[PDB]
A paper describes a structure:
Seneca virus A (SVA) is an emerging novel picornavirus that has recently been identified as the causative agent of many cases of porcine vesicular diseases in multiple countries. The full-length SVA genome is approximately 7.3 kb in length and contains a single open reading frame (ORF) encoding a single polyprotein that undergoes proteolytic processing and cleavage by the viral 3C protease (3Cpro) into four structural proteins (VP4-VP2-VP3-VP1) and eight non-structural proteins (L-2A-2B-2C-3A-3B-3C-3D). SVA 3Cpro is composed of two topologically equivalent antiparallel six-stranded β-barrel domains (A1-F1 and A2-F2). Three closely positioned residues (His48, Asp84 and Cys160) within the proteolytic active site of SVA 3Cpro comprise the canonical catalytic triad.
In this work, we first report the crystal structure of wild-type SVA 3Cpro, which indicates that SVA 3Cpro adopts a chymotrypsin-like fold and possesses the Cys-His-Asp catalytic triad conserved in most serine proteases. Judging from the electron density of Cys160, the sulfhydryl group appears to have an alternate conformation (with an angle of ~120°orientation). During the refinement of the SVA 3Cpro structure, we observed a portion of extra electron density located in the cleft mainly composed of E1’-F1 loop and α3. The region is composed of dominantly positive residues, including His75, His78, His79, Arg147, Lys198 and His202, which neighbor the proteolytic site. Considering the rough shape of this the non-protein electron density and the complementary charges, we considered this as a phospholipid-like ligand. Based on the lipid-binding assay and lipidomics data, the CL 74:6 molecule (with a molecular composition of C83H150O17P2) was assigned to the identified electron density in SVA 3Cpro. The CL molecule, especially its two phosphate groups, was well defined in the electron density map after refinement. Interestingly, the C-terminus containing the natural autocatalytic processing site (GEPLATMQG) from Molecule II, inserts into the proteolytic active site of Molecule I. Therefore, despite a crystallography artefact formed by the two contacting molecules, the SVA 3Cpro-substrate complex likely captures the physiological peptide cleavage process of SVA 3Cpro. In our SVA 3Cpro–substrate complex structure, the main chain carbonyl carbon of the substrate Gln211 was 3.1 and 3.7 Å from each γ-sulfur atom (Sγ) in two alternative sulfhydryl groups of the Cys160 nucleophile. These distances imply that it would be difficult for Cys160 to covalently bind to Gln211 through a thioester linkage.
Author numbering: 4 to 211
């Protein structure tokens, strides 16, 4: 059970983010995934909730009326729970692109490892149950997910999902939902990330 990769994910990728609201005594804390430069990945249902007035990430406070550049991923016309957010100028994130994406799909009942900063830092684990085209949720249908056998809790959203295929372990999801001891995470592809970063203007050298 080598977790050198997952520890690297915990060290460089997963961070706490807290949404501050004028509706409730405390901020809603979850996880975010630093991608590169000034962009990170976040759950759509958290980002789009109209209540928050600021959020904190990597020691910075950002208000809602700031001009974020964002990409909301869809699949065959159905929304996914995945959002990409680029902040204004500031201290750069690590370049974590090498940690995302698998070219082969994980073998059924291989091990999924979640990497979370939602309650302090922790890992969770469960076996891969396969991809699903959609889930039916309390906030509607969401597209392009995969499921894993493990009981998950409110706040674990945004945790990185590390799967294995072809001898390699990579992040291919972030946690979205739970239902009766089975969690669901929204799928992340390297090609989607690359094209979203280009749309957002996140400067990257292209390997020729
Ligand atoms: C074993 C054999 C394998 C099997 C084969 C598999 C399949 C075979 C074929 C099958 C049938 C064919 C069918 C196709 C399947 C193919 C396989 C496949 O999967 O292909 C997929 C293609 O995607 C991929 O490439 C993945 C990648 C996967 C594969 C792709 C194919 C390959 C392609 C290329 C191949 C190789 C190339 C390799 C390259 C190497 C790398 C490249 C290096 C270079 C198909 O998926 P689809 O086409 O369906 O979607 C496209 C994309 O995924 C998402 O779209 P996106 O652009 O990113 O979204 C646009 C927009 C962004 O948001 C905003 O910007 C507005 C927000 C704007 C606000 C902010 C922006 C403005 C800024 C403000 C201020 C900014 C300040 C500065 C500004 C300056 C500039 C500003 C910006 C420019 O989002 C919205 O929509 C609005 C969002 C709303 C839509 C949602 C609806 C409801 C929303 C809410 C949730 C629910 C709540 C309900 C309330 C309503």
């Amino acid at each position: 059970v080598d977790m050198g990769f997952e520890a690297a994910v915990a060290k460089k990728v997963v961070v706490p983010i807290t949404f501050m609201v004028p509706n409730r005594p405390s901020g809603l804390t979850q996880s975010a995934l630093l991608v590169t430069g000034r962009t990170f990945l976040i759950n759509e249902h958290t980002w789009s909730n109209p209540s928050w007035t600021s959020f904190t990430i990597r020691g910075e406070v950002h208000t809602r009326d700031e001009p974020f550049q964002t990409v909301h991923f869809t699949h065959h016309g159905i929304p996914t729970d995945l959002m990409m957010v680029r902040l204004g100028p500031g201290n750069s994130f690590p370049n974590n692109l090498d940690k995302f994406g698998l070219d082969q799909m994980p073998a059924r009942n291989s091990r999924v490892v979640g990497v979370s900063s939602s309650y302090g830092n922790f890992f969770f684990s469960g076996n891969f149950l396969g991809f699903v085209d959609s889930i039916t949720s309390e906030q509607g249908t969401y597209a392009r997910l995969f499921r894993y056998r493990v009981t998950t809790y409110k706040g674990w959203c945004g945790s990185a999902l590390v799967c294995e295929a072809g001898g390699v372990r990579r992040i291919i999801g972030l946690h979205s939902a739970g239902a009766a001891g089975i969690g669901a995470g929204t799928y992340i592809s390297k090609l989607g990330l690359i094209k979203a970063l280009k749309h957002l203007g996140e400067p990257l050298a292209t390997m020729q």
